[PDB]
Amino acid sequence: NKLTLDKLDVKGKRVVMRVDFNVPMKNNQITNNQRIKAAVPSIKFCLDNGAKSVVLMSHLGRPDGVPMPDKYSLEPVAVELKSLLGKDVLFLKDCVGPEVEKACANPAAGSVILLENLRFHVEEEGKGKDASGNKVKAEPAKIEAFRASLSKLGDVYVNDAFGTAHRAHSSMVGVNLPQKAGGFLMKKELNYFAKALESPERPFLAILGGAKVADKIQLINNMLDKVNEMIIGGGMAFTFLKVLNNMEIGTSLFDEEGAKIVKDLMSKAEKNGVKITLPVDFVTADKFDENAKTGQATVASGIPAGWMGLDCGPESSKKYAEAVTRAKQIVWNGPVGVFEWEAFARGTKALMDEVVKATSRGCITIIGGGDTATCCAKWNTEDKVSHVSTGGGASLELLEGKVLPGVDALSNI
Ligand SMILES: Nc1ncnc2c1ncn2[C@@H]1O[C@H](COP(=O)(O)OP(=O)(O)O)[C@@H](O)[C@H]1O
């Protein structure tokens, strides 16, 4: 087991906390601050328990090892943090080097400091692109020095950056202080997924949809050993329907690599008695456009040529609803339609309503982060499901049964 924040004595201690502040932006201004909010409990705790300082560190976007302050600065996060925290947050313009080090040697008894975006330095990811756009690899010597500089900012280290936990980056596995402790966001996320995967309340339903039909492979195969039911929705379904049922799918998303094992996966489900729910009907579109001409189809009719299926239909949502009703526990990863467009958002909307009714009655509902977490924000259901993950990719690594380098890097009790 690992050291965690509650076990950690901070009093008088400078805390360098890795957090995931990689919030969606538009035109420099934050569109979702959930990732920020989620870190608050760890930060406050340190403040309330007498920390000399919290020096926060994160990445935003993918600047690829070149500094891009015009486009990917964390400054706006500082402003949000201070508002959240009802306290001052001092933003630094770099994350390493003498100046930053001076700022972080001995702050006051409670000063919050935010570092600039980690990824401006190629040493964080260990690789990136140079200013001319060329793929480059960072240098071991330079990587150690970078790692050393982060080390100085703090007496002790805390990782609350669950969403970045799958990334073996310098700030996540390279900060070599004596005590490295997992924050409250880390413990909470890990605990939910672990409980859901190891000892779920049953029946356990996984809802898989979205697009990323191929990446959902290791995931389904693992889930197939954990679950009692699975909805396979959204873009992914079409590959299953064409293969199993010889559906005419038009221009709908199709995944050739995926089509190869669809039969294997289905037989595994049959073996395990996992009831698989695929869509039986669809909202079609004449083109991939918000204002496209719409239509309806079924597995049996096909989708016209060469229309595409962009939402499930009414029968499908009902069958989805039947599964939600039976479930004691739900993991939902991926929307079941192109929810960003009104024409194609009904199936997702109806699924959200059902999941929401289920929470209400004690079904454990876990939402996968990424696009699904986005639906919650959009529709105000963030506080009406048991947990909305802050990490899409990291959660998948977890659902896939993989280990997280961010978790592993922590100190052992
Ligand atoms: N039938 C469909 N055809 C094409 N795109 C779809 C379909 N259903 C959902 N999508 C798209 O899938 C995306 C979500 O993909 P993904 O990243 O896998 O979900 P998440 O981020 O929740 O894990 C959205 O951009 C959505 O518009």
The count of structural domains within the chain is 2
Q: Which residues pair with 54 in a beta bridge?
A: 15, 112
- Is 348 part of any domain? yes
Q: List the one residue out of 288, 297, 352 whose CA is nearest residue 320.
A: 352
Give the end of a domain, one of 185, 203, 233. Answer: 185
C-alpha–C-alpha distance, residues 413 and 182, integer Å: 11
360 is in an annotated binding site: no
- Say yes or no: CB of residue 338 within 6 Å of ligand 1: yes
Q: Do residues 224 and 284 share a domain?
A: yes
Nearest CA to ligand 1 atom 23: 334
DSSP for 78-132? HHHHHHHHTS-EEEPS-SSSHHHHHHHSS--TTEEEEPPPGGGSTTTTSEEE-TT
Phi, psi of 111 (to 5 degrees): -85, 125
Resolution (A): 2.2
Tell me how the structure was determined. X-ray
C-alpha–C-alpha distance, residues 342 and 344, integer Å: 5
**Residue of 2, 14, 180, 212 marked active site:** 212
Residue 189 to residues 162, 171, 172, 174, 385, Cα–Cα distance (Å):
7, 19, 16, 22, 14
* CATH number, domain with residue 263: 3.40.50.1260
C-alpha–C-alpha distance, residues 127 and 137, integer Å: 4
Q: Do residues 11 and 128 share a domain?
A: yes
- Say yes or no: CB of residue 337 within 6 Å of ligand 1: yes
* Burial group, residue 295, by CB count within 10 angstroms (0-12, 13-18, 19+): middle
- Ligand 1 centroid vs 308 CA: distance in angstroms? 14
Nearest CA to ligand 1 atom 14: 210
- Is 411 part of any domain? no
Q: Do residues 337 and 378 share a domain?
A: yes
Find all residues with CB under 8 Å of 88, minimum gap 6, and list them.
82, 111, 112
Tokens at 68, concatenated: 């891009």
119 is in an annotated binding site: yes
Please give the number of the atom of ligand 1 that sits closest to the Cα of 341.
27
- Is 409 part of any domain? no
Q: Are 216 and 193 in contact (CB under 8 A)?
A: no
62 is in an annotated binding site: yes
- Is 111 part of any domain? yes
Q: Do residues 9 and 59 share a domain?
A: yes
Q: Do residues 36 and 67 share a domain?
A: yes
Q: Are 206 and 320 in contact (CB under 8 A)?
A: no
**What is the C-alpha end-to-end distance of the chain, expressed in Å?**
6
- Is 276 part of any domain? yes
Q: Do residues 94 and 233 share a domain?
A: no
Tokens at 120, concatenated: 């401006």
Range of the domain at 68: 1-185
34 is in an annotated binding site: yes
C-alpha–C-alpha distance, residues 125 and 174, integer Å: 11
- Say yes or no: CB of residue 333 within 6 Å of ligand 1: yes
Mutate to test the pocket of ligand 1, among 278, 320, 338 (most ligand atoms within 8 A of CB): 338
Give the end of a domain, one of 126, 154, 185. Answer: 185
Tokens at 34, concatenated: 């959930």
Nearest CA to ligand 1 atom 13: 210
- Is 412 part of any domain? no
Find all residues with CB under 8 Å of 168, minimum gap 6, and list them.
405, 406, 409
